[PDB]
């Protein structure tokens, strides 16, 4: 999986409270709409695990702003549970089609606070997803 280091935000951020990503992506325009390249997508990988007091959930969500100051959600995942965040779980959020300057990634954490677990968010084209599909399944 190729990654652009510049489109990388949250390099390996330790998500404990419901906090935002470290870096905020700045496009060189008011309406990048790079959701429109029909190719870009946010990926959040997980390490090491959704360790928590539990039961907790982590909602990954992309946010836009006009300026780097006040954000609002443009895509969201849903309450992905702890123990669905084993080391190695690509949560893909497709890039929203109407992007504005300054995209960020927020982590909506359901109580209690996550105690250990990093996540790395990046815009790629595109993910490595080739899971095996059944064949017979009578044989087998």
């Amino acid at each position: 999986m190729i990654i652009d280091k510049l489109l990388q935000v949250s390099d390996g951020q330790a998500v404990t409270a419901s906090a935002a990503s470290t870096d905020v992506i700045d496009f060189g325009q008011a309406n990048p709409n790079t959701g429109m390249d029909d190719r870009s997508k946010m990926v959040i990988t997980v390490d090491e695990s959704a360790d928590a007091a539990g039961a907790a959930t982590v909602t990954f969500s992309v946010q836009d702003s006009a300026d780097n100051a006040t954000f609002a959600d443009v895509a969201a995942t849903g309450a992905i549970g702890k123990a669905n965040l084993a080391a190695g779980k690509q949560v893909v959020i497709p890039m929203p089609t109407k992007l504005r300057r300054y995209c960020r990634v927020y982590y909506t954490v359901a109580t209690g606070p996550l105690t250990a677990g990093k996540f790395s968010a990046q815009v790629v084209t595109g993910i490595q997803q080739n899971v095996a599909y059944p064949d017979s399944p009578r044989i087998a």
């Binding site: 999986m1 190695g88 779980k89 490595q128 095996a132």
Partner: protein, 327 residues
């Protein structure tokens, strides 16, 4: 505390009464060969390789008389899978390389180790490619077949071992539509050693340095179009192997049943990849089964395995011998 590493004054370490040692005995290079055997085709998507694969058949129906039946729809999912780039620079302070004029001789002796280091890494990663942990690497042969529950789980053959001292053998078919590597638009595969020439460096303070540098791109991905064409022979407890196909796990049936697992070896070309430790016990086990049969006095050594079943059986070192048993 501990100081290092670009290329510490151990050019001294490579010379005689004289210039850089040409006849250096290449120790840590191993002769694994998927890299020679592997097929390379440009990947089709933007930096991934899409592949449409049939997911559901129309079934048809037995139809009772006078009754207009449902139309069917053949459902079909497609999968895309990515590449990764593996590349490195190779810098030396120009002052260190220049002395005794072994500037070129050095660049060279260092280079041989780089080619070998890349093949070493590329093949070690083609088998243990975790794109789920390393993110940056393309995903290889494990854990595409890992848990026995996975849809290609029938294709991994449990050798029946247990504990950490146990390998797996691979059986694949390299060909356009069953398994291949993929390289980008428009970077070519594989390993490109471009020589950057002399250029300035930076002392960690800022305090100027000056040197040579060499690049080594080699960016591959890996289509596994369908897992039906790849079968893994897991938990081969290597301590328990005996030449008498006796205690522990036999290779020859565990190997042919892997051959029967492939739906028709038609295209492109099959290959077994076994750890060298396995290849040795294989040679011995074969001659021992044939020994109770018909082997001549002179063919007592046993021809080294070449074509197991008319499938080249390739030695690959960059393949772990103490692998965790696959639950």
């Amino acid at each position: 505390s501990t100081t290092n590493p670009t290329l510490a004054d151990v050019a001294a370490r490579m010379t005689p009464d004289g210039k850089i040692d040409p006849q250096i005995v290449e120790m840590l290079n191993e002769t694994n060969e998927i890299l020679d055997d592997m097929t390379v085709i440009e990947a089709n998507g933007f930096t991934e390789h899409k592949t449409t694969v049939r997911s559901g058949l129309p079934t048809g129906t037995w139809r009772k008389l006078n009754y207009g039946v449902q139309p069917e729809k053949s459902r079909t999912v497609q999968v895309k899978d990515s590449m990764g780039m593996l590349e490195t620079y190779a810098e030396v302070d120009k002052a260190l390389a220049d002395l005794n004029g072994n500037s070129a001789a050095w660049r060279l002796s260092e280079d041989r180790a780089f080619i070998e280091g890349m093949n070493q890494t590329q093949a070690t990663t083609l088998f243990y490619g975790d794109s789920s942990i390393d993110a940056e690497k393309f995903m290889g042969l494990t854990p595409r077949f890992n848990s026995l529950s996975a849809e290609n789980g029938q294709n991994i053959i449990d050798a029946g071992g247990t504990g950490s001292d146990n390998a797996s053998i691979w059986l694949t078919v390299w060909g356009p539509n069953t398994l291949h590597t993929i390289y980008p638009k428009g970077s070519q595969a594989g390993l490109q050693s471009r020589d950057l020439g002399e250029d300035t460096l930076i002392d960690a303070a800022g305090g100027r340095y000056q040197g040579y540098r060499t690049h080594y791109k080699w960016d591959i991905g890996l289509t596994l179009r369908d897992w039906r064409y790849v079968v893994r022979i897991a938990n081969v407890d290597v301590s328990e192997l005996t030449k008498n196909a006796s205690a522990g796990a036999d290779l020859i049936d565990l190997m042919t049943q892997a051959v029967e697992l492939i739906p028709n070896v038609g295209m492109g070309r099959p290959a077994f990849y076994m750890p060298r430790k396995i290849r040795s016990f294989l040679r011995r086990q074969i001659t021992n089964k044939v020994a109770a049969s018909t082997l001549t006095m002179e063919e007592i050594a046993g021809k080294k395995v070449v074509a197991f079943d008319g499938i080249p059986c390739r030695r690959t070192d960059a393949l772990l011998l103490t692998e965790a048993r696959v639950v």
